[PDB]
Amino acid sequence: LLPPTIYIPYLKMLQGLANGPQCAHYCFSLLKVNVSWEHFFHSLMLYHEHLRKDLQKEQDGLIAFLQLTSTIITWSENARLALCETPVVVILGLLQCSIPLKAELLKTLAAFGKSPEIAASLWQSLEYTILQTVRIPSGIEVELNEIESRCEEYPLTRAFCQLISTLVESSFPSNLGAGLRPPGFDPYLQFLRDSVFRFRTRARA
Amino acid sequence: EFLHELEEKMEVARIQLQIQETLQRQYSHHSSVQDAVSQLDSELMDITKLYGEFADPFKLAECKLAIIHCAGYSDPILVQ
């Protein structure tokens, strides 16, 4: 069933079905072997182009698409890399667009992040995706601004935190941000000053 | 509030004095374009007017910086 609304509920229903580590595996196979994962990313890619070229129905569909990818990627193993490489590139592109959604893709991206060394593609995406627009003077504040400009809303931040929590778990590239800015991990922690400084003054416990 | 207006005035006036002083030193200037000094001494000017007209064209970066201080323009990129 193709109708956009049926299609989105289908995605949601399957997410529910994906529950066990075991079920999640089947859901992985369902798309991979006997709609394919590729079709799914394609849809996301297409929406991305339409969104940017343009500059509720879509939110329904996209939100569902993400809800599903998230559910499985979380409950999976070596398979995670396979989905990772593939939604990773597309998801990154989607994040660049404004979207309401930003947070959600960040949550999914995080699920994709692997335990090992091959974090690097992800860190580059994140740094590039904060760094790109911002103009950084030689001081600290300008760096904070880069993050603040991009991570405008609450969902954006929570998603960002989940992704960061995952990447920071155990590793990252040397001389990160080289070329564009003063390198290193430090500015990210500064950003948290913006966050947990503020937290005390939340809304909404 | 009278005080408020007075102090702001003193600040802006001071800037013109500085700009005026630099104009003398600057060798890019022509004596006949005395008109600028007449304008400077003559009255208080709009900050944007001071900034756009004077600071940028005469590249007085310091003045521009000070002016933006008074304005209280925060934008880090522009400031940097």
Curated annotation (Swiss-Prot), chain A:
The UniProt entry's coiled-coil ranges are none
Any idea where this protein resides? Nucleus membrane; Nucleus, Nuclear pore complex
Q: Could you tell me which cysteines form disulfide bridges?
A: none
Q: Domain of life of the organism in this record?
A: Eukaryota
Tissues where this protein is expressed:
Expressed in the testis.
Similarity comment: family membership: Belongs to the NUP186/NUP192/NUP205 family.
Assembly and interaction partners: Part of the nuclear pore complex (NPC). Forms a complex with NUP35, NUP93, NUP155 and lamin B. Does not interact with TPR. Interacts with TMEM209 and MYC.
Sum up the protein's function in the record's words: Plays a role in the nuclear pore complex (NPC) assembly and/or maintenance. May anchor NUP62 and other nucleoporins, but not NUP153 and TPR, to the NPC. In association with TMEM209, may be involved in nuclear transport of various nuclear proteins in addition to MYC.
What is the associated disease?
A: Nephrotic syndrome 13: A form of nephrotic syndrome, a renal disease clinically characterized by severe proteinuria, resulting in complications such as hypoalbuminemia, hyperlipidemia and edema. Kidney biopsies show non-specific histologic changes such as focal segmental glomerulosclerosis and diffuse mesangial proliferation. Some affected individuals have an inherited steroid-resistant form and progress to end-stage renal failure.
Q: What's the name of the protein?
A: Nuclear pore complex protein Nup205
Q: What is the lineage of its organism?
A: Eukaryota, Metazoa, Chordata, Craniata, Vertebrata
Q: Which residues of the full protein are shown?
A: 504 to 755 of 2012
Swiss-Prot record, chain B:
- Places the protein is found: Nucleus, Nuclear pore complex; Nucleus membrane
**Protein name from the UniProt record:** Nuclear pore complex protein Nup155
Q: What is the documented function of this protein?
A: Essential component of nuclear pore complex. Could be essessential for embryogenesis. Nucleoporins may be involved both in binding and translocating proteins during nucleocytoplasmic transport.
Report where it is expressed, by tissue.
Expressed in all tissues tested, including heart, brain, placenta, lung, liver, skeletal muscle, kidney and pancreas.
Q: Which family does it belong to?
A: Belongs to the non-repetitive/WGA-negative nucleoporin family.
Assembly and interactions?
Interacts with GLE1. Able to form a heterotrimer with GLE1 and NUP42 in vitro. Forms a complex with NUP35, NUP93, NUP205 and lamin B.
Q: List the disulfide bonds.
A: none
- Disease annotated for this entry: Atrial fibrillation, familial, 15: A familial form of atrial fibrillation, a common sustained cardiac rhythm disturbance. Atrial fibrillation is characterized by disorganized atrial electrical activity and ineffective atrial contraction promoting blood stasis in the atria and reduces ventricular filling. It can result in palpitations, syncope, thromboembolic stroke, and congestive heart failure.
Q: What residues of the intact protein does this structure contain?
A: 1139 to 1218 of 1391
How this protein is processed and modified after translation, per its record? Phosphorylated. Phosphorylation and dephosphorylation may be important for the function of NUP155 and may play a role in the reversible disassembly of the nuclear pore complex during mitosis. Disulfide-linked to NUP62. The inner channel of the NPC has a different redox environment from the cytoplasm and allows the formation of interchain disulfide bonds between some nucleoporins, the significant increase of these linkages upon oxidative stress reduces the permeability of the NPC.
